[PDB]
Design a protein around this ligand. Structure first.
Ligand code: 7MX
Length: 116
């Protein structure tokens, strides 16, 4: 609270570490359904069903233009990608399973990197 300072973790490396993690996401072989925004003109249902679309290229742009205040807002957008995927796709589908694989892949890197 006011004039009661709390110990803060060092966040000076966060931008660089998130960029590194995002690069590893982008180059994963199962990253293909998530590299670009879903085409709202070709994909039936998506625009009405998915209230907040998100993809790796949009995250990359936001990260490169200072639109993430902190690393937690970065993680929210990444998880948003796989939450949207689960909403729209069957688990038994190629995109559905790709989503599950990428989520697991992200979370281990998140823990290994920041859960010091
Ligand atoms: C490159 C193929 O991507 C898609 O068209 C697509 C991706 N996701 C993550 C979806 O949920 C639905 C589609 Cl149609």
């Amino acid at each position: 609270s006011m004039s009661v300072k709390k110990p803060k973790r060092d966040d000076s490396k966060d931008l660089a570490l998130c960029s590194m993690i995002l690069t590893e996401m982008e180059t994963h072989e199962d990253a293909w359904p998530f590299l670009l925004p879903v085409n709202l003109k070709l994909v039936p249902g998506y625009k009405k069903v998915i209230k907040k679309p998100m993809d790796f290229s949009t995250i990359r742009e936001k990260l490169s233009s200072g639109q993430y205040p902190n690393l937690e807002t970065f993680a929210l957008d990444v998880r948003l990608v796989f939450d949207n995927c689960e909403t729209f796709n069957e688990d038994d589908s190629d995109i559905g399973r790709a989503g599950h694989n990428m989520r697991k892949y992200f979370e281990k890197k998140w823990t290994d990197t920041f859960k010091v």
